[PDB]
């Protein structure tokens, strides 16, 4: 019905292709269910993670990019990579929605096969987690087997967090920030400060005169928001497949999943809610 | 400030992993950007296309279980397979939201590298297009180069259609359908038929009596309507990203794409529109 | 640039109109902000909570209908009515991305005309959730105030739940359901029951012999789910606009907010996850 | 199940309530069915409809204030107002998804009490089209029966548009904006104008400088592409429901809205899409 157009390359047998720019024999060949018999519905489980370990991995390329532009104090290209930042964040938030297709009785079909393996293994987001600040040392054992994955953990432990790059760029433009966020052991995970409440009072409060600062605030609590989202949606999924069972990985499940939700990535932004006043 | 809980598997060295299971060596090497100095935004170009064809692979997978449940009148089952499918093109509809922080003097910085590439090339997506009805045997010579994939094209062009299906199981339960549906020249892209007017106006206007063809018809309307939405959101994203330039696979590009959002996959179900009555 | 066909209606003076059917004059003379002077966000405030009740009036609408199918053990209709009730639930969640637009800045410039109205004194709201099956006696006092809405809220109060007439639905198809589901005080919120644990594992265990009861008890999982995403929306946009502040309805805000997600409308359905085996 | 704190009001017979605030008296009377006997399906029509026109209403609310913010040059406040918007409309967009659940048989029910009324007599959403450039004065007509309606709409008709006040923004900063648009008939269309690609290709050329502007041209893009497929989704919806059948307004329905999806608010941004080179 819809006639092919003259002019379309057609004799690509030789030059860069569909399948070649994007590596697509090596892409879906990476599905390899391990069902015997075939289970139908591994697929879409082994699919569903692979979409979220790709968008991860877009997202850490993007949060690093964000660090760059605040070290050098580019607020519009900063929001506009966290912009985008929070499309990811979303698209791994909506995508819970095919996985709750799968019943209990459908996962429990296959769920031996995959042994001990579990998220919890996820080097990608475990990377992203100490990235935005959840930066627990004892993770890095967790991940022995892989000396090189410990290895890459360790370096962003290492490094200021995203929410900490955003008080040195505070810094900067005159705020009371105070000094020990120049430098200190960054392995350390942030520890909640009440000196920064006036810091942001006065930011939102003066929308005006701190409008730069006032807008980075709110892209990250968009940011935090969205991630407490997929971890909830994650969450109500693991509560519908596997109810209250242990996990795969070894931990109590809903309990332990639900200990990480009550963790909050930039404290300040939140606690400022109890004290700021009508802005002008 | 999580803790990490007792009993969490931590000697993996020599067992099934998350990275293991999900192939993810394999999975996120399969990334490899063509600029030179490194675009940033080229990474989300790739991983927008792979996650695409992720979701396609599955919608794939989904789709042939639908027609095996069709073949053997098993409805209910067709029914839950058809729902996630609709999920799947929902998240693949989605998406779109991340490629519209994309702008186009960003894209000119590295659209050169694509060279003639294109999803016009896509396998997978043919094969879906293929298996919904929309058969055009032109679109073999786009896979001359590819002589394994080629085949598996003709093979679903040989077979009915997931729409020709359903005719196939309104057939076998006493409605009015045709005898040439029991075989024809299956190649031959599906003509609007007159005659099955009757045939659904009968069903949408008995609910009550032909309640497993009434749910088929609409999970049927709803995935026709849902991939003109993923051809609408595509299309829209060109229109941002190159406007009305011609495309990287050698078409005029927006106009190309009208031509197929004009296309109906289950002509008849959209006409009964205009004759059918109210419900009793 | 589009000129009107012929054939357009254009003179409507006294036929019906648009807003005339949809009584848009009524409608839209609703929004009275109380701020002197106005403030600009005032209007989002009034209208995401207008929006929000109206889409409760529509499912408390769908879930009686879904109510009467499941009396008359009508279940492709329920089912279809459940659908719809999903998508109603699926906007009411959705929509608090408008709300997070709201900073805290700016709601401080009108919270204090408020006083002490709380959607904690939604009565429509009160209504779905004791529908639903979170019945709590202590809440009819809230509405001393307005006789007439107390009366219709005690009414859902002594009625079946939506689940406990599942629960019914059940023992007429020769599950064994307990006799108390027979009739019983229906004002006391339903108590986990340990003997439906056999029923269920019966029904997800072979689900070709129950596919009914099975599809039912997937639906209601999801809504059950969709329900919480809606609590959990709602108390993150709590969150970041007023933190951990008492609420204006006089709770702690956030904390007892947090004490609903605890709750479950569906309880057997969730526990027999633990125990539920391979279907077949 | 959750005890109600101490320190919640329950005596509220003389205060604020939440009732009493968002007026729901009046705004959930607004609902008034015309079946007899009642048709189920008819309360879903009337709170789509609904929902989207409190929506509407604040879109207009929203885009007024981006105007005068863009005649103040106040382009962070602007920028944020329209990102407030773009999700105003994302939710209008969003829920087509519930009226899909209806179907021609269920419509066929109730179809014939709407006589003559159609969403093309809708005064808010022209106001919207109206403001941001797609004027039409023989839309006036329409609303001959609304005096004060009419004479609304014809304020909008002749005021710059969003579109108009964006280039008169870009002519005080010193961008080569012809003389015409500091003063002319703004009731006519505005026509698409060559001599702004230059103006263009050096803002999209020269982010770095014009990173104002270019965010933005970008916004306008977002607002045009999700109005677009609001038009889109409304388009598919009719189809599934009333199929090519004449519309209730008098028009030819389906072919009619697809006149509107060809109409361009910005055309001038999506033409400079086949010049623009890189960013520098
Ligand atoms: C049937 C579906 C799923 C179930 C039943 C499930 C269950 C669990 C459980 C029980 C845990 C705790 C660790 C353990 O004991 O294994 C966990 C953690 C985790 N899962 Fe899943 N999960 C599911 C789907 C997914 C998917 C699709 C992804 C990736 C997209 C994912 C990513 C993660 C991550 C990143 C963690 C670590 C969370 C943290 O450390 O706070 N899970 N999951
Ligand atoms: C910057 C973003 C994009 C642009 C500018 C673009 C442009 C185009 C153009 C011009 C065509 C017509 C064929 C040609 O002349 O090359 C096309 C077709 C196609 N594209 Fe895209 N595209 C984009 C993103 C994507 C993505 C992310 C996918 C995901 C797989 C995709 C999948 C397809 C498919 C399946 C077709 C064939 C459609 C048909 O045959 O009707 N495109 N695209
Ligand atoms: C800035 C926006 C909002 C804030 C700060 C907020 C805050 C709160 C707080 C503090 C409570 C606890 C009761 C109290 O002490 O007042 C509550 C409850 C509630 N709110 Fe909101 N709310 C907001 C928006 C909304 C909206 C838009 C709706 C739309 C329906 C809504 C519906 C409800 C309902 C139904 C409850 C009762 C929940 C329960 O009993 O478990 N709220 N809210
Ligand atoms: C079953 C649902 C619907 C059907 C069958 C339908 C059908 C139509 C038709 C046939 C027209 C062309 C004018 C005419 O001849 O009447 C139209 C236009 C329109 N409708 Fe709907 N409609 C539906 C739902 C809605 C809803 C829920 C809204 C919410 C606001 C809406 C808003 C509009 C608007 C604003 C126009 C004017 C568009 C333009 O002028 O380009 N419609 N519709
Ligand atoms: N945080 C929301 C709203 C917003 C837009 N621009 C802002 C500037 C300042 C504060 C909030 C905003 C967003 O990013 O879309
Ligand atoms: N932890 C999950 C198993 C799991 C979920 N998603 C995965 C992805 C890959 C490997 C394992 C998983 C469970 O307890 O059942
Ligand atoms: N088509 C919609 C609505 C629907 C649900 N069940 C149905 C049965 C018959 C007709 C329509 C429906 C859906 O699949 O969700
Ligand atoms: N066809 C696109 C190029 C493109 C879009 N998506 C792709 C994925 C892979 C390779 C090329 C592409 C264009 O005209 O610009
Ligand atoms: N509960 C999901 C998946 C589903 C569809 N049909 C089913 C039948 C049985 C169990 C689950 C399903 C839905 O309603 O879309
Ligand atoms: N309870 C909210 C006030 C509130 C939120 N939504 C409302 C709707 C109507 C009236 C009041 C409200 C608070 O503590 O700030
Ligand atoms: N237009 C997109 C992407 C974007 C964000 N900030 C920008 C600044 C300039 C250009 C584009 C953007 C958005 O508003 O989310
Ligand atoms: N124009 C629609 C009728 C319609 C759709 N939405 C409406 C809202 C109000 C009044 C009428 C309508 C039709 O042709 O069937």
Redesign the interface.
Known sequence: ?????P???????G??????????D???????P?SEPAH?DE??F??Q???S???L??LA??LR?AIVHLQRDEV?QCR?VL??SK??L??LT??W??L??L????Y??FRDV???????????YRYIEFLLG?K?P??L??F???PAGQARLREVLEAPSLYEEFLRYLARFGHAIPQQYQARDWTA?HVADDTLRPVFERI??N?DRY?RE??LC?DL??VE?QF??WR??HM?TV????????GT????GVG?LQ??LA?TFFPEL?????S????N
């Open positions: 019905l819809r006639d092919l157009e002019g379309i390359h057609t004799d690509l047998e030059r860069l292709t569909y399948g070649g720019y994007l590596r697509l090596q892409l879906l060949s990476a599905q390899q391990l139908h697929m879409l082994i699919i993670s692979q979409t370990e790709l968008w991995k877009l390329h993007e990019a519009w506009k912009a985008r499309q990811v979303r698209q909506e995508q929605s095919v709750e297709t019943t209990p009785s459908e429990m079909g995959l042994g001990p393996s579990s998220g919890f293994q996820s080097l990608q959840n627990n004892q993770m054992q967790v022995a087997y892989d995970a939102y409060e929308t409008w006032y807008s709110e609590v968009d928001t407490q989202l909830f949606r109500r509560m519908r497949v596997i109810g209250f069972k242990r990985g070894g931990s109590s332990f200990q990480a963790l939140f606690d400022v809610r109890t700021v006043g009508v802005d």
